[PDB]
C-alpha cells in the first residue's frame, strides 16, 4: 500500500509544473540581418570635419526665427513594430563617417525586454538636396543584447572602433558592486568588402586593462577622439568610496543657506552611501602596442570635480573639447577645451545660460551643492572657436524633461533658438554632431522624443543648418 502512496506523491511533486524565471543575460537572441544590403545611392559627396575654416555664422542675438530645423530619415530606416521602443541611442561622427547604435525593447522603453542591439557604421552624405543624412553601410549585432552596455565609439583609419561594457548583472552603473569589469571592442569597417570576417566585423578581446587605483573602468559616452594611432574613449572609473581623498573645505557652499560641506563628496556617488564613487575620465587604446593592446584609464583632474557622468570628447576646430553631463548638483553646462589629454585637464567654460532640467532637489540653474543624482545628456558642439559659440539641443523647462530646443549660444548669452517639438513634448537624451557640407555648417541632432500618443517610440534625427545672416 505504501508504494502506492509513494507513486502519488512523486506524481504530484514532479508532474505538476511551473517554470523558472527566464534569464536572458545568458540566453542568446538572433534576429535577421538588419541591413543585408546598403541603400542604393549614385556615388554622391560626403562631409568633412568642422576643422580649419573660419566659417560665417550669425553670432548676434536675435528674436528672429533664424533656425529652420529639418527632420531627416532615421539612421536605420526600417519599419518598427507596434509595441516596440528604441532606447539608449549613440551617434558619433568623424571624417564623414558615423557610428550609431541603439537598443530595441519590447513593452516598456526603459525597463522592457530587449530583443536586439544594433551597432553599425555608415557615411554622412548629401542626400541630394544639400541636406546631410545618415546612410548605414555596415551593421553588426551582438548575439546577446542584454549583455552590451554603455558603448562609445572612435573612428580611426577606415575602421570605427566601438568600446562596450559587458555585463551579466545588468546596467554596470547601477549594479557596480557585482559587475565583472569586462570590456569588449568591435572594429567595423566603414567601407566593407564583399567578404572577409576579420575585415568587415572584427571583434577584439580586451585582456589587459590598466585601471591604476580604480577598481573598475568602463566606456561612458557617445564618442571619443583619436590622436594618431591612439583612441581615447569617454569613460568612468569606479573608486571605492573610502579610498576617495577629498577635502570638504573645498566644496563651494558659499552663497548658500541650505548647504553642508559634505554635499560635494556624497553627491559623487549614485547614492549618498554607495560603495563606489564615480570619476570621469578616458580610456586610452594604443593601436600600435602590439598584437594585444592594453586599455589605460586616465582620470579627469579635480577642477570643478563632480560625479562621473556620460561624457564626450570630440575634435572641433583644431582642438579636443570635453563635455561632461551635469548629473549632479551643478546644473550648468560643463564643457570646455582639453588642455591635456593625459592627464585629462579641462578648461571648463564659465557658462551661465545653459542648464539642464531636473527634480525640485537640483532644478535647472542650480549652482549650490546638494545631494542628488539626476540629469540628462544634452551636449553642445563647438562651431566657432574664436567667439566660443557652441550649439546643441537642450530641454527647456525647470523640473521636467520636455521642450527640446536647438540653441546656439555663448558663455553668457543665448543668441538664437528654435523648437524641435511642441512646448509639452517629452524628451531625454540629445546628441549633437556638427560638420561641413559643401563648406556650410550643419548639425545633426539626435533627440530622444517620447511622443506617447502613437506609433513606435524612436529618436528623431534633426538636421539644422547654422545661419550666416542675422537679418
Amino acid at each position, epitope marked *: 500500500s505504501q508504494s502506492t502512496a509513494s507513486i502519488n506523491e512523486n506524481v504530484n511533486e514532479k508532474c505538476k509544473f511551473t517554470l523558472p524565471p527566464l534569464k536572458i543575460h545568458e540566453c542568446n537572441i538572433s534576429c535577421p540581418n538588419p541591413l543585408p544590403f546598403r541603400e542604393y545611392r549614385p556615388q554622391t559627396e560626403g562631409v568633412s570635419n568642422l576643422v*580649419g*575654416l*573660419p*566659417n*560665417n*555664422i550669425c*553670432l*548676434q542675438k536675435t528674436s528672429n526665427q533664424i533656425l529652420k530645423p529639418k527632420l531627416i530619415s532615421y539612421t536605420l530606416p526600417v519599419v518598427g513594430q507596434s509595441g516596440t521602443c528604441i532606447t539608449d541611442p549613440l551617434l558619433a561622427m568623424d571624417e564623414g563617417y558615423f557610428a550609431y547604435s541603439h537598443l530595441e525593447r519590447i513593452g516598456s522603453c526603459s525597463r522592457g525586454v530587449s530583443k536586439q542591439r544594433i551597432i553599425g557604421v555608415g557615411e554622412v552624405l548629401d542626400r541630394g538636396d544639400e541636406v546631410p543624412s545618415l546612410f548605414m553601410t555596415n551593421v553588426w549585432t551582438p548575439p546577446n543584447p542584454n549583455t552590451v552596455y554603455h558603448c562609445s565609439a572612435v573612428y580611426n583609419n577606415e575602421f570605427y572602433y566601438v568600446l562596450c561594457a559587458v555585463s551579466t548583472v545588468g546596467d554596470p552603473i547601477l549594479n557596480s558592486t557585482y559587475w565583472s569589469g569586462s570590456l569588449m571592442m568591435t572594429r567595423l569597417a566603414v567601407k566593407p568588402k564583399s567578404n572577409g570576417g576579420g575585415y568587415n566585423q572584427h571583434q577584439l578581446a580586451l585582456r589587459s586593462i590598466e585601471k591604476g587605483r580604480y577598481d573598475k573602468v568602463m566606456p561612458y559616452g557617445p564618442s571619443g577622439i583619436k590622436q*594618431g594611432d591612439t583612441l581615447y574613449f569617454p569613460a568612468v572609473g569606479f573608486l571605492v568610496r573610502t579610498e576617495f581623498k577629498y577635502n570638504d573645505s573645498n566644496c563651494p557652499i558659499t552663497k548658500c543657506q541650505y548647504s553642508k560641506p559634505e554635499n560635494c563628496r556624497l553627491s559623487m556617488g549614485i547614492r549618498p552611501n554607495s560603495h563606489y564613487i564615480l570619476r570621469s575620465g578616458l580610456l586610452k587604446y594604443n593601436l600600435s602596442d602590439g598584437e594585444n593592446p592594453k586599455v589605460v584609464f586616465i582620470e579627469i583632474s579635480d577642477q570643478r570635480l563632480s560625479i562621473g557622468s556620460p561624457s564626450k570628447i570630440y575634435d572641433s*576646430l*583644431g*582642438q*579636443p573639447v570635453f563635455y561632461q553631463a551635469s548629473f549632479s548638483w551643478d546644473t550648468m553646462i560643463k564643457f570646455g*577645451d*582639453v*588642455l*591635456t589629454v593625459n592627464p585629462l585637464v579641462v*578648461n571648463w567654460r564659465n557658462n551661465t545660460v545653459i542648464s539642464r532640467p531636473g527634480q525640485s532637489q537640483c532644478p535647472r540653474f542650480n549652482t549650490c551643492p546638494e545631494i542628488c543624482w539626476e540629469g540628462v545628456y544634452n551636449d553642445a558642439f563647438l562651431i*566657432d*572657436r*574664436i*567667439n*566660443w559659440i557652441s550649439a546643441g539641443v537642450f530641454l527647456d523647462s525647470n523640473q521636467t524633461a520636455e521642450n527640446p530646443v536647438f540653441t546656439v549660444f555663448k558663455d553668457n548669452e543665448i543668441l538664437y533658438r528654435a523648437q524641435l517639438a511642441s512646448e509639452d513634448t517629452n524628451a531625454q537624451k540629445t546628441i549633437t554632431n556638427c560638420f561641413l557640407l*559643401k*563648406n*556650410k555648417i550643419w548639425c545633426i541632432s539626435l533627440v530622444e522624443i517620447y511622443d506617447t500618443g502613437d506609433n513606435v517610440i524612436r529618436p528623431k534625427l534633426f538636421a539644422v543648418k547654422i545661419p550666416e545672416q542675422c537679418y
Partner: antibody
Amino acid sequence: EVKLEESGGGLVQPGGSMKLSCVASGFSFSYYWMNWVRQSPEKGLEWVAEIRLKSNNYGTHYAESVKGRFTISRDDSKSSVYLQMNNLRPEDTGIYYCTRVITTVFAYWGQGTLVTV
Amino acid sequence: DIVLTQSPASLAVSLGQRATISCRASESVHDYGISFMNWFQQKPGQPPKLLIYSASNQGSGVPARFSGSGSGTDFSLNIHPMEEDDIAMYFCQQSKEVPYTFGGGTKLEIK
C-alpha cells in the same frame, strides 16, 4: 585667459644675430599654429614666419624678405616659439609680435618685443 | 602674392557719425564659400586686436558698433556711431594665401 609673452629683443648690430622667444600659456599650445608678425612705422604690419603643428611635420613658411635668414621653431614641452634671426639688417628694425592662429585668423597677439638693428 | 589697398589713408569723423574704411584686393580672397578678410584695431602702445574676421564675423570682445561686409576683392569696415575710443589704426588683412599680407592701415581720428 590667453597670454603670449615675447622676450629676447634689444639692440643688435647689422650682420649680427638675435633669437626671440615667445612663451605661451593658458591654452593648448601644441594644437595651434604660431606666427610672427613685425611692425615698423615705414611699412605697417607685415608677416614674418609661420610654424605649423607636429602633425604637419612642423612645416614652415617665411616672408620672401626674411626667407633664408630667419628660422622659426617650436618646443612644445615649454609651450614656446622661437625666431632665430641671422645676418640681421637695419630693415629688420621694428616690434616683433607673437601670435596665435585659430582657424586661419590671428586672434591673439602678444605685447611685442622691440628689435633694433 | 595678394596685395591690399586701403582707403582713405585717414579719416576724421565727428562723434556720433558713421566712419567707413574700404579695402581692395589685387586678387580675390574668396575660397570655400568664405571671404578670408580680417580687420585689426591697433591703439597706440598696444598690439593689434582682432576686430572683424572672415569679412563679416564680429570677433570676440567687439561691440555692435563694429560691422563689416564684402566679398571677392571689395571689402569694408563700418563703424557706427563712432565713439571717442575708436581712435586707432585699422589694418586690413588677407588670409587666403601664404604670404599673409596687411594693408598699410587707415588711421581713424575724430573732429
